[PDB]
Write a protein that binds this DNA or RNA. Structure first.
Ligand SMILES: C[C@H]1COc2c(N3CCN(C)CC3)c(F)cc3c(=O)c(C(=O)O)cn1c23
Ligand SMILES: C[C@H]1COc2c(N3CCN(C)CC3)c(F)cc3c(=O)c(C(=O)O)cn1c23
Ligand SMILES: [Mg+2]
Ligand SMILES: [Mg+2]
Lengths: 471, 198, 485, 194
DNA sequence: GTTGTAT
DNA sequence: GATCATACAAC
DNA sequence: GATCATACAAC
DNA sequence: GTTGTAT
């Protein structure tokens, strides 16, 4: 028997509760950001490893160490949910361009799970570092964490088109997104091509970007789907296996073992003759071997009945401006480019403000070193550091900071070679402040800096095309 | 007054921190999520008229589940076993073990989902219970909460704030579940897109 | 086949593999250290918590975080094993004096398991802070962690006898320890007693340390074993639930349990009674209701008319775990090896470890105090000769030459010279010296005092006693377990 | 070589049917199983994870022994049979390698597995089919374990050979036996601490 | 059935 | 540690 | 997330 | 069977 009871209509609660879980699952779990092409977990694992200091140059850390933090700080969920995400970012078959470098068991192509976070340690991947470049130069907006006792970035700089390169997936609520991976180089080529001729067309963009490039390789039969996919954001494509009867490369998100098990089932059920044997002679250095049968007939059947040939349905759905949107190739490129521009500017402004600030305090030190005799005479006569600062500011026309900078001067910096050492630095800053000032004033440079810094990535991290397109 | 005396067989679910009283007009059945909260409820629940029945994971969506799958689900099974009401052609509201079914899910979005899955079950396979005004919803001010915390805030009737689930138009009710929970995605997609402020 | 194959003798490998695991568990898992009364995982959790900065003053931190760094920096085992061990030392019924403060479902007496790490958050307990006091003043040796890239303490300072106070248990290989929790204040009174009168006897000690003081309370039957345990380290004690008969509102007997024995599960006993009542192994019970509230234990076994509650009571004491025995097996690691110690031996062990910690601190405090005053002497000379000093600096090209001159002109050490070179211009005010003087003067006193403490062993023990009285004065409880003949 | 399509849940079997070259790796846990399974040469090398700590048969009721799921897996793998059905001439593997972790715990699992083999598979040990991996295990890549312990051309094995059965029988009884006092003495005797 | 973040 | 069910969309 | 067998000693 | 660290 309650005292303060209230009435709540069923339909009202249902609509309220559902929308609450729908929006939350959509714009904060299952769908990636059109910009950095990351979903909350992956973005938190990355920013995590970053703060943890598991950079590509530093040594690995035990996953329990990483998961423990990412959880106790940013991602308010289960270890399994995180460590599982971290494990996909370290599998060559999962990501076209891995975002983690782990040691130990991190699973297999045969569905074999990873080991315990007590046996596996990991760290950022070299290319992943590009996702964080200049993160500490106000290139990104930060927010409070669930605990409200920590801060995290809403997005990463993402110095490479992560979304398109690695892909996206997928299951949300009332909607699902499915984006295939692409070659690092080719993508960058598209990004630049757009920055050059905005009047470009789908056909033109496909000149430097054939289509998908899955980390497994294989083949994509047909091109008509790729086009409609890049134009509307929705389409379908077929993915076959590279064979010679031996199978060398299996399609995207396809398990060799499962195919093996299913092939065995089809063999013991009048579903295909010829099936003399079906082995898997796959090594740690490469991948599946399988009279009177023609094979070409039995081989053609396996691809049309089993999983050796699957269909990939384009459904490029991301989060742009807080809302989920079905974007096309162009819409995604323009969205990334704009995010890139914001970062170079933001970073440029950051350096700008620092240099100028540094020079201001540098101008004072010089003034002081020039009149060290009077400055010291002023301080010595001063009773409190408060008075000592007012005097210096009144005499040498200095600001509170400059004055404070002078009062915090170590004696060892009152030598001769010092003055000239500050001058040399100061002179260099004026040139820096003057160079940065031109970049913020000339939209053209920012664009060029982007192009340049991209080609540097394409030159350090681009692979050879794995997926051979057919017709 | 009438109350249990141990020694009883009961044969009730392994979980379910059943109370002491046997008056289906005072006792309460709390449907919690996970033993992380169940444990907080179980200990500090006035084990005299308040029973705790932990539901694990996400309850099956009866709107998209084959009846053959509903009769196989142990999670929904334990629930009907806890009420002692009966299923379908046996549902006797006059034989329920509790006249107060309090849904107490986590204060997170995921909690709001389980809350959604439950109500569909309670409205699809226990309508009589809701039509009798037994189904209530806890209004917290859960795993990260101590004993005294849980009770003093939502389990104590002298300070707790509950909400009675009432149905207005059964016609509008059958539609809301058919849209939000129904196998139809387009409608649900349109709904979300129409009634959502980002 | 293979190329280079060796041959291993079954008996040979067996004895080797077993001896490895045997010692591994004994000295590095199962039994605790006589000094801080801790086992590897408990010590790693405490120290780890100290580093994470989750002190009594600071707010709690997610459990997964705590175990995450402890497993990643110190304890090379499963996550569960650490979180489990952490939760335990946060339970008022498992630890006589808890060492951890948690927030959320940390389990119940009825055997309930604490919530997932993703829900619970913890930190050090005010008293646990005594286990670490002066951890950073070189009072405890450190060693490389399993990874050889982190440094951890072999033992803790432990400013209160955590072995006797919280007990131990216990299962290893070839051996197993079992020590009962005691009362803080009492244990301290025992430690202080053995310090002031070395000729004290088990009897004399038991005058201030009557015996076990379990967290739940209950009763002890027969002190004969208690004296046997304290004098030999081995002994048997009888534990019984505190009970009381009540008369129902109808007029029949009602057996009420308020304090079950140590490590006894109420629910487990509740299920045990039902299995016996429904089995005719015990007749006369009307009902068994558990009326325990988040503010006390009430396990009621109402008897039927024409039935002696007492008769049923004793039957319960004899058949259920409502009455059990406690196997005193006071075994702890001492000098690297496992030993069955008496009460006196465990105290002597604590008092010693206590003397060492204090001295080291005193030394550490002295070496620092002096090192500072040395720099203060330099800064003074410098602030007295600022003109000439600044002259030397400015007239110098390289700092190496500037320092070299200052050292040579003012007769200063390399340390002193650098100090002068690093002085901020703000330090060259009028009021600055009189400040540096006061500090310096204060240091001479401290160094005098500290120099004395290290000269007089009488002061070290007195410092210990005084500091114990404070721990006692701040954390001591009232006895919970009633001892009776 | 087999042909598949034939018919334990775990245990990644090889591809050959020649119990003269084939090998079974008994590793502890699926943590070390994946690493071992992902670079084993699935032709004459099969893996079988021993989940948890093996039951000590030198102190177990022959009823609980015939109950243990782990011991049934290892026997089911071998294909030898049990007790009166022991058929060494039917072993599916001429090389059983004990590849436990390099920690103490693994060292323990070594003794358990040995007691199990010596007591209820003596014919196997008597024939020299039992070896012991010699690592320099989940914290190890595929090529790391393959190029260190699993590759025949390299690696280093330890053939288990019994000399004085009486001494062997005595040892197990002493260490893995029921009597504890004798075991302690052994600890006190052959053990240097400080 | 399977994909991947979730309870 | 391994294993169990389930929501959610889309083939 | 919940549960499942096991080592080890002593009772 | 139960206890508490481990696989
Ligand atoms: C929240 C709990 C709910 O229960 C779970 C499962 N069950 C659902 C109910 N069934 C009766 C028994 C099995 C399950 F199979 C897997 C998981 C799981 O992987 C998981 C996690 O955090 O990673 C968490 N949970 C799981
Ligand atoms: C190391 C693994 C070994 O397997 C385990 C169990 N089994 C042993 C084998 N049985 C066939 C199935 C059950 C078990 F029952 C419990 C645990 C457990 O609690 C645990 C942990 O780290 O906390 C770890 N493990 C366990
Ligand atoms: Mg899971
Ligand atoms: Mg466990």
């Amino acid at each position: 028997q309650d005292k303060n009871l209230v009435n709540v209509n069923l339909t009202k609660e249902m609509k309220a509760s559902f929308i609450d879980y729908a929006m939350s699952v959509i714009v904060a779990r299952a769908l990636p950001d059109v910009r950095d092409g990351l979903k909350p977990v992956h973005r938190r694992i990355l920013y995590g490893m970053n703060e943890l200091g598991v950079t590509p140059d530093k040594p690995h850390k035990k996953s329990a160490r990483i998961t423990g933090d990412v959880m106790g700080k940013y991602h308010p969920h289960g270890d399994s949910s995180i460590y599982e995400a971290m494990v996909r970012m370290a599998q060559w078959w999962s990501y076209r361009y891995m975002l983690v470098d782990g040691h130990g068991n991190f699973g297999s192509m045969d569905g074999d799970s990873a080991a315990a976070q007590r046996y596996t340690e990991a760290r950022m991947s070299k290319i992943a570092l590009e996702m964080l470049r200049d993160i500490n130069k106000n290139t990104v907006d930060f927010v409070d964490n669930y605990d409200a006792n920590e801060r995290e970035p809403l997005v990463l700089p993402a110095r490479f088109p992560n979304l398109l390169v690695n892909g996206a997936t997928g299951i949300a609520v009332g909607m699902a997104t499915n984006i295939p991976p692409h070659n690092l180089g080719e993508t960058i080529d598209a990004v630049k091509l757009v920055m050059d001729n905005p009047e470009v067309t789908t056909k033109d963009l496909m000149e430097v970007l054939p289509g998908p490039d899955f980390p497994t390789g294989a083949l994509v039969m047909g091109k008509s789907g790729i086009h409609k996919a890049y134009e509307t954001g929705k389409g379908s494509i077929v993915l076959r296996s590279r064979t010679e009867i031996v199978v060398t490369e299996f399609p995207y998100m396809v398990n060799k073992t499962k195919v093996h098990e299913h092939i065995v089932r089809l063999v013991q059920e009048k579903r295909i003759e010829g099936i003399t044997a079906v082995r898997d002679e796959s090594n740690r250095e490469g991948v599946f071997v399988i009279r009177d049968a023609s094979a070409n007939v039995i081989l053609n059947n396996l691809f049309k009945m089993t999983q050796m040939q699957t269909n990939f349905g384009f459904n490029m759905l991301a989060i742009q401006n807080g809302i989920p949107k079905i974007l096309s190739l162009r819409q995604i490129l323009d969205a990334y480019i704009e995010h890139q521009k914001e970062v170079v500017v933001r970073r440029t402004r950051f350096d700008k403000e620092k240099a100028e600030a540094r020079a201001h305090i540098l101008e004072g030190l010089l003034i002081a070193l020039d009149h060290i005799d009077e400055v010291i005479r002023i301080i010595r006569a001063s009773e409190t550091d408060a008075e000592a600062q007012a005097e210096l500011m009144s005499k040498f026309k200095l600001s509170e900071r400059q004055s404070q900078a002078i009062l915090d001067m170590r004696l060892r910096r009152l030598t001769g070679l010092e003055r000239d050492k500050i001058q040399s630095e100061y002179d260099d800053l004026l040139a820096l402040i003057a160079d940065l000032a031109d970049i913020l004033a000339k939209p053209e440079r920012v664009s060029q800096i982007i192009k340049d810094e991209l080609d540097e990535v394409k030159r350090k991290f681009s692979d050879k095309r794995r997926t051979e397109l057919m017709v | 007054k009438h109350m249990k005396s141990g020694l009883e067989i009961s044969n009730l679910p392994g979980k379910l921190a059943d109370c002491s009283s046997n008056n289906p007009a005072e006792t309460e059945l709390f449907i919690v999520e996970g033993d992380s909260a169940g444990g907080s409820a179980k200990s500090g629940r006035n084990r005299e008229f308040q029973a705790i029945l932990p539901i694990r994971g996400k309850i099956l969506n009866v709107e998209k589940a084959s009846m053959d799958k509903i009769l196989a689900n142990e999670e929904i099974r334990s629930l009907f076993t806890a009420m002692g009401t009966g299923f379908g052609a046996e549902f006797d509201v006059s034989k329920a073990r509790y006249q107060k079914l309090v849904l107490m899910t986590d204060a997170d979005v995921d909690g709001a989902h389980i809350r959604t899955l439950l109500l569909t079950l309670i409205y699809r396979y226990m309508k009589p219970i809701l039509e009798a005004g037994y189904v209530y919803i806890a209004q917290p001010p859960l795993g990260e909460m101590d004993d005294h915390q849980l009770w003093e805030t939502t389990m104590d009737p002298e300070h707790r704030l509950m909400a009675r689930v009432s149905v207005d138009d059964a016609a509008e009710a059958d539609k809301i579940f058919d849209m939000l929970m129904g196998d139809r995605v387009e409608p649900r997609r349109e709904f979300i897109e129409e009634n959502a402020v980002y």
